[PDB]
Amino acid sequence: AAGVAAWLPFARAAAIGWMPVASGPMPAPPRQERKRTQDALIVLNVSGTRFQTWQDTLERYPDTLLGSSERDFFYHPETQQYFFDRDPDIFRHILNFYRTGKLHYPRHECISAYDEELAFFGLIPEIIGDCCYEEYKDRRRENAERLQDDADTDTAARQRVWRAFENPHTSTMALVFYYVTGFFIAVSVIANVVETVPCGSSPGHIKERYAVAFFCLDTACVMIFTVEYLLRLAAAPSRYRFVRSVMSIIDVVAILPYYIGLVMTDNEDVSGAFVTLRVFRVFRIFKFSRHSQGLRILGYTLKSCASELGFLLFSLTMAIIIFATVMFYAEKGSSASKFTSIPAAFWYTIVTMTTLGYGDMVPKTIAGKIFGSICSLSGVLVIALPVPVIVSNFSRIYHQNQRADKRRAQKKARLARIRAAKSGSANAYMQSKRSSSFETQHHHLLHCLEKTTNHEFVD
Amino acid sequence: AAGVAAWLPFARAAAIGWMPVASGPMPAPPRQERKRTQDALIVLNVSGTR
Amino acid sequence: EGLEQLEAQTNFTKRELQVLYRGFKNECPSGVVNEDTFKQIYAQFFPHGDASTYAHYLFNAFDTTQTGSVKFEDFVTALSILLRGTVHEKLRWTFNLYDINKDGYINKEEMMDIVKAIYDMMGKYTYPVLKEDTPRQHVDVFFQKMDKNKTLDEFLESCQEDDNIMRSLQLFQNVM
């Protein structure tokens, strides 16, 4: 490597190994200099104290800024030294790297400062040793998501109400429509549940109540929902991506059952589909998605931990199979023999997975009870395996939600500070027009612009 | 502000953009002590460390 | 380089060259400046309006060979030939500045965008209350100053035929 130049003369001695075999013109060493060592401990004073290093130590990596004559841009001639104006402690790590050829990242420093110091000295971030590289990468990813959140979104016609619509806490009309459609979803699901109660839609008194008025309550509500969906069809920034969004899928799934039942009863009386209609009528519960602040958090959390839940599914299925087979095979000889099949044992294994317990189905042989107890314990551990990951992701996302709110407030404060500084500069220019060394030339350029545009500046 | 005060000469090049579009009495530069950055580095000590 | 770059590709002293390089590296640690840096320095210098398209043209003039980001050598060479160069060099720089495309003539739209870049900076806080008309009279005055027919040589001669712009050229040739 280029950093082991001090061992270069030793390789010269290696020629003696093959020198008797060597035979040729030997164009001789190319005008070598300084037979005796004249290594100068060149001094590099960085905003204060100084660091001395050998010339070959600084020149073993000429590809960087400190190599070649580029460093002489920061050379200080009247003092006979290199007065760099950079941070004097990251330079220490740079010097250690130059000596070693390997750079270590100390843990307790800001990544922004470290990276801009790296860029100032013409280095690459990929030379960090694996001992420090993993930590630097963690810090990179955390500050990267930080800066991503710093500039995610900014609030910026007929489509304009769309921004009001999808941010209902902007205008009174959007907020009232949002609240009232939530009330409509709630009243529709309440209508369904109070339809199911015997007092409303059962022959409680055949002698005499059964109101068919509820048959209207859904339809109107359904039509109401349609309009906002149609609203999102009208002010759609994306015609197809909006439908591809899961929210739209949930909305259309909740909307469809009334119309599909209309079509069915218009054409058929398919058995088993009307009850399916009633079942699917409930997905206004899922339509509550926008009103529920945390339901989006729950969905994103479930999406994030997909592999963990899949592994849970696989493990629980395997445990259910094993235990159900064992208990059916070791219990089929019982008198009652409620373990009449492997599916019959499935229900017992699944009620003993979750410490649920019904007593309707219990083993009656000595092996049965002990296998059931072991089954219960194994189910407990299996089901408890992924819940820490699930709740960790949920709480995490909750934390990024609140911290993103705080960061948005901080960015608003910072833009207010920037505009305040702009106003301060403007009024400073105005008072200079009415009445440091830098401000003299600043206002000189301002007056030159005024002359070239012949437009005087007022308060 | 002066946060990039080391870039004033470049801004002067910007002025070069707009002479043919200019119409004024040209009050000239307001003069200065020195037209450079010859101000040498200052050594400042903080508890025995300069 | 900095070792032989004393006058070969610059027109400044060693002290001025080194201080300019140190300042540029302080503002651009990577050693290469981009368009957005021009935008934000030009906005910081003049905090009274919008400074987008004029800075874009300035960078395009600095962006030699359309690389997209100029290095230090060409930047300092341009600064040297504009601040301590010859008159023909300044006129060549202005020619390249006003020639957004690569045609032999400068048309109406080029002057339109140039005068808009000049006039948008003051914003809505000026005493004369400029409107879109004042760029029209300015472009008319410039064009009647230019040749009647639908020339870079004519613009050069007009520049050197008027002493007001020549005395507006040594404003910064002397200082810094």
Curated annotation (Swiss-Prot), chain B:
PTM entry text: Phosphorylated by MAPK in response to signaling via the metabotropic glutamate receptor GRM5.
Expression by tissue: Detected in ovary, in corpus luteum and in granulosa and theca cells in the follicle (at protein level). Highly expressed throughout the brain. Detected in amygdala, caudate nucleus, cerebellum, hippocampus, substantia nigra and thalamus. Expression is not detectable or very low in heart, kidney, liver, lung, pancreas and skeletal muscle. Not detectable in human heart atrium.
Phosphothreonine sites (modified residues): 37
Localization (cell): Cell membrane; Cell projection, Dendrite; Synapse; Perikaryon
Region annotation Interaction with KCNIP1, KCNIP2, and other family members: where it falls in the sequence: 1-19
Assigned protein family: Belongs to the potassium channel family. D (Shal) (TC 1.A.1.2) subfamily. Kv4.2/KCND2 sub-subfamily.
Function, as annotated: Voltage-gated potassium channel that mediates transmembrane potassium transport in excitable membranes, primarily in the brain. Mediates the major part of the dendritic A-type current I(SA) in brain neurons. This current is activated at membrane potentials that are below the threshold for action potentials.
Other facts: The transient neuronal A-type potassium current called I(SA) is triggered at membrane potentials that are below the threshold for action potentials. It inactivates rapidly and recovers rapidly from inactivation. It regulates the firing of action potentials and plays a role in synaptic integration and plasticity. Potassium channels containing KCND2 account for about 80% of the neuronal A-type potassium current. In contrast, the potassium channel responsible for the cardiac I(to) current differs between species; it is mediated by KCND2 in rodents. Is specifically and reversibly inhibited by the scorpion toxin Ts8 (AC P69940).
Subunit structure: Homotetramer or heterotetramer with KCND1 or KCND3. Associates with the regulatory subunits KCNIP2, KCNIP3 and KCNIP4. Interacts with the regulatory subunit KCNIP1; this interaction mediates the capture of both the N- and C-terminus of KCND2, preventing N-type inactivation and stabilizing the S6 conformation, thereby accelerating closed state inactivation and recovery. In vivo, probably exists as heteromeric complex containing variable proportions of KCND1, KCND2, KCND3, KCNIP1, KCNIP2, KCNIP3, KCNIP4, DPP6 and DPP10.
Protein name: A-type voltage-gated potassium channel KCND2
Shown residues in whole-protein numbering: 2 to 51 of 630
From Swiss-Prot, chain C:
Function field: Regulatory subunit of Kv4/D (Shal)-type voltage-gated rapidly inactivating A-type potassium channels. Regulates channel density, inactivation kinetics and rate of recovery from inactivation in a calcium-dependent and isoform-specific manner. In vitro, modulates KCND1/Kv4.1 and KCND2/Kv4.2 currents. Increases the presence of KCND2 at the cell surface.
Whole-protein residues included: 48 to 227 of 227
Organism: Homo sapiens (Human)
Bilayer-spanning residue ranges: none
Any single GO CC term annotated in Swiss-Prot or TrEMBL for this entry: dendrite
Binding locations of Ca(2+) 1: 99, 101, 103, 105, 110
Predominant location: membrane
Protein name stated in the entry: A-type potassium channel modulatory protein KCNIP1
Keywords: Calcium, Cell membrane, Cell projection, Cytoplasm, Ion channel, Ion transport, Membrane, Metal-binding, Potassium, Potassium channel, Potassium transport, Repeat, Transport, Voltage-gated channel
